Symmetry: C3
Subunit: 234 residues, 3 copies
């Protein structure tokens, strides 16, 4: 059990084959500060260098899973200061060789919600808020949102989520028919742990061979969608 460089991501081994990546940039409520960006990329590179793990649980702290762009960063784009860069926090889970469970025990906002959606198994908390809120800032969505939201939540619910940038409680999404398990926040991480243990029962090579096949169309199609979304910004 170890912190990354900036100490705002903590890695905990749950058994020898399960790694939990806990995001805890409390100063920024797990918004994508420079420190959370570096520590997250460090976490997944460590996972990539340590093939003992068969499953990853990605989770937040307290009431926050991940909050997406920082308020400063969004403001700077809105004005004549910076532009949207492609990055690649959003696809950490997708690029991971092994199954990733996004245990979203807390709010998932903008790029934060999108990051969780690229995981193989996503669990929501009934009391938390989830929103792809890019268009509230006046901007079309980025970070692969226009691809992964319809892929995981279906075409129709994605139109509303993306065009209107509304906030949904986990309870609201459960009642609109989402395929994600939705639980009380207090139960979200235990359930992710149980499921990771069941996944760890499989040969590692079988997990990886199947995940490579299930996500090949996503890994293959995402660069083109990123280019479209950059185009939209203009």
């Amino acid at each position: 059990q170890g912190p990354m460089t900036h100490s705002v991501v903590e890695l905990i081994e749950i058994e020898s084959a399960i790694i939990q990546v806990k995001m805890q940039d409390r100063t920024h409520k797990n918004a994508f500060s420079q420190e959370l960006t570096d520590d997250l990329i460090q976490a997944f590179e460590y996972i990539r260098q340590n093939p003992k793990y068969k499953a990853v649980i990605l989770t937040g702290y307290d009431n926050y899973f991940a909050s997406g762009g920082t308020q400063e960063g969004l403001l700077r784009i809105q004005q004549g200061l910076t532009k949207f860069t492609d990055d690649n926090l959003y696809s950490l889970a997708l690029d991971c060789e092994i199954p990733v469970i996004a245990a979203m025990q807390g709010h998932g906002i903008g790029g934060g919600f999108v990051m969780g959606l690229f995981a193989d198994i996503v669990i929501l908390s009934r009391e938390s808020v989830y929103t792809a809120n890019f268009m509230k800032y006046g901007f079309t969505p980025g970070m692969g949102a226009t691809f992964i939201v319809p892929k995981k939540l279906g075409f129709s619910l994605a139109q509303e989520i993306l065009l209107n940038a509304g906030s949904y409680r986990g309870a609201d999404l459960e009642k609109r028919g989402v395929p994600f398990k939705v639980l009380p926040r207090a139960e979200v991480l235990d359930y992710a742990v149980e499921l990771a243990q069941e996944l760890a029962e499989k040969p590692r090579n079988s997990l990886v061979t199947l995940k490579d096949h299930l996500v090949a169309p996503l890994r293959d199609q995402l660069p083109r969608v990123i280019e479209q979304e950059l185009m939209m910004h203009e």
Copy 2:
């Protein structure tokens, strides 16, 4: 300052609900919002007006009382069965898809056949708990047209579309809600109020972002639809012109 007026046949009313929200209210009470010539012309005219006046951010398409849209008139269906007309002769099916801004289909009343299907092309669809919805084409003996074989699986998923399209059954909105559909379902008396609120939230965004985003989200729909229409017209050539379709339309309408 916020206009409200009739289209030329008076069976569609346009109301500017706010400076950037336009409501297209179908009100062919004589035909229960079936596609009479009057309703066909006034819907085309309403969507052209919207295209000619690029200041709106959302459109609400809705019916009156307990009817959203009832589809083909009996006469209209018989004209197709006879080979006088084809469903592509006017194109009501794609009105909401070809609209450059978001459209909300507030289906506060029943949605039947082409009427339900034209609604399903909207970007956001809301159903009423107590209304009936049906892609009822196959009850008359002929295959679904109006792009139904494309937009039903796209919006409600492959599996539920199989059953809705092959069996032509009628579902309450509550039935579809229990089946797991991603559309918001509400008591009829709340459907339009909820559509207006959602249109108000959409109107908080810049119009150019909405149009840019919609173009990107529905590009596959606009790209893929024409081929499926061709295929549906070939299915009609195989199924619509049998004598028993005439007997079913006259007997079961």
Copy 3:
């Protein structure tokens, strides 16, 4: 015979799997009799709908233990005899009335029907990965096509067992009923389909499933390429010996 064919009303055919000795696992007898049942249906142009169902608490249980050991040894494959695609290849609509448990390839064969009904009490599982096998028989294509990409990832990667009532609460588009109502509901639905002209049912089915039928050979090849990398290890044989029927 472990498959019984029963006509219902004029144009409905029920295919009833009742290999009670094997709990509707794919014994040699069930395999041969299912193939013959669907060939009889293929040669008979009276029928307008098929009801595929099992007996008591079993819909279809997938490979026998010796069958899975044959696959692990490389003597046979999950796709042999193309049982997995019988309902897709059938020219008329098929209803899988899964009044009982659906396990492994028995589940997947049912999921290629045009309409699938589950029972609340019964267990459903694409359980290939419990043994170390990657999913075969078109599972990687028909589970996401039928139940959506997200739910399919969890079903296929983890090989878990779900009650019909658990899937119902996760949001599946299938009708889920008490077991004692499943076949009665399938019969009402089949009478409703039988109201349509047969030529209309066939013409529309051919269209709605053309993408499945066109893409499925590609997907089968992709599954075979996964299976080459995964099926022949020793620990797949121990898993089959230790976990079968657990």
